């Protein structure tokens, strides 16, 4: 017996957000006397939007579709259902670990896996091909192959997102890098590797290699791929659909996608995605539960690779011929189970504002890489009282 409203806030961006919407309001078909309200909330402001909410128990979601950051964050603050022993978890083995372990908090299931992801190297094959050059598996590969687009084709080689901490991380790994040593309890991101991190996206910036901006740094970077501005960009599986809405790649076969680029010592890219967290506070708690199992479904899962390219956490859905024969999926499945995790901790998400800041300055030309990485390393002590 399941009836009521559901309101469910969805963060998926432009491209993704009719399809999850009809996914969400698709419950409605077995469960008829269920109200599901979808709600859009920009990924900017959906933490705080959520926390706002929650803390002053008005108006908040049902069920919220929660970033693998935000489940230890809003779980530390009693702003999530805890989902052990209830209708939300089914067959739960069937999701990759390091998805299983975002949903978890002090030993209690917060969260149920919806997506994963990393970053890759998308690229104008077309571009390339023009220009005469192979994809780049380092940044010294980057910076050699950006020349020869300049110098062949008039565009750009590189958008390097400037905006987005997130986008520091592949190069930090590349050359040698991490946030933390997590079982020593150890910041790291002032290690010289971090200076090396900064020295090299600045390089790329003032060697022409790539543009950036300051601000808006999506649009930014979406509309320099899809004009040909840029040969290449870095980007997650969020993105394969808003590029195939433009006349460029609609011909899906001119969209590249490779790993990111080694830097000096090695490779590497982050892990990220979304989970499907319940309210504590939800007034519906059965029709929520319900509606998350629904959501996590392997059926819903492979709908949502069929129509997006998202990748899914369950296991058994890389097995169904249409999501193992997908070429999107099958670059990206094996980047993610490479992809960097980080730990799941209540500060965790506030480990990037700390970078955002000394990327602006080091792009800038304000901030050297070697103060740049000290000043992460010092915000991070200051963040994590019993690191080192
Ligand atoms: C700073 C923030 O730090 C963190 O976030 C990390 C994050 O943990 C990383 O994993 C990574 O997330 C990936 C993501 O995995 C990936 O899927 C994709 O997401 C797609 C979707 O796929 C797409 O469907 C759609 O949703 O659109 C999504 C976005 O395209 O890309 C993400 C990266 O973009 O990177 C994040 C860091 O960016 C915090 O969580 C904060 O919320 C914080 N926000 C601040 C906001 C404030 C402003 O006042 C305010 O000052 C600050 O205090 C606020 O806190």
């Known amino acids: 017996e399941l009836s009521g409203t ?18 969400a309001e698709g419950f409605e078909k077995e469960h008829p006397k269920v109200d599901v309200k979808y709600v859009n909330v920009p990924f900017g402001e959906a933490n705080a939007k959520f926390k706002n909410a929650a803390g002053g128990n008005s108006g908040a979601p049902d069920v919220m579709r929660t970033e ?51 970053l890759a190297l998308f690229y104008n094959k077309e571009l390339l091909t023009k220009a005469g050059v192979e994809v780049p598996g380092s940044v010294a590969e980057l910076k050699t192959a950006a020349a020869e687009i300049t110098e062949k084709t008039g565009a750009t080689g590189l958008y390097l997102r400037g905006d987005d901490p997130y986008w520091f991380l592949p190069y930090l790994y590349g050359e040698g890098g991490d946030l933390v040593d997590e079982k020593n309890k150890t910041v ?35 509309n320099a791929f899809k004009s040909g501005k840029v040969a290449m960009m870095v980007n997650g599986p969020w993105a394969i659909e808003d590029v195939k809405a433009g006349a460029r790649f609609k011909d899906a076969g001119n969209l590249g996608v490779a790993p990111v680029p080694a830097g000096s010592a090695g490779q590497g890219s982050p892990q990220g995605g979304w989970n499907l967290s319940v309210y504590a506070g939800s007034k519906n708690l059965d029709a929520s539960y319900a509606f998350v199992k629904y959501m996590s479904s392997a059926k819903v899962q492979q709908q949502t690779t069929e129509k997006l390219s998202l990748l899914p956490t369950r296991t058994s859905v890389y097995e169904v011929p249409s999501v193992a024969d997908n070429e999107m999926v099958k670059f990206f499945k ?55």
């Open 6 to 23: 559901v309101t469910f806030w969805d963060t998926s961006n432009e491209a993704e957000k009719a399809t999850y919407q009809a996914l």
């Open 68 to 118: 693998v950051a935000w489940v230890a964050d809003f779980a530390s603050i009693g702003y999530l259902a805890p989902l052990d022993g209830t209708p939300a978890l089914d067959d739960g083995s069937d999701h990759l670990p390091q998805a299983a372990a975002s949903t978890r908090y002090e030993g209690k299931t917060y969260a149920v896996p919806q997506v994963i992801d990393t």
């Open 188 to 222: 790291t991101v002032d290690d010289e590797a971090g200076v090396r991190a900064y020295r090299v996206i600045k390089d790329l910036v003032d060697s022409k290699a790539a543009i950036t901006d300051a601000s808006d740094g999506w649009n930014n970077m979406q």
């Open 334 to 388: 094996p980047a993610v189970d490479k992809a960097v995790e980080r730990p799941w901790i209540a500060e965790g998400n506030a480990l990037f504002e700390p970078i955002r800041l000394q990327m602006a300055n080091v792009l800038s030309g304000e901030t050297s890489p070697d103060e740049a990485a000290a000043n992460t390393g010092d915000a991070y002590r200051k963040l994590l009282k019993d690191y080192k």
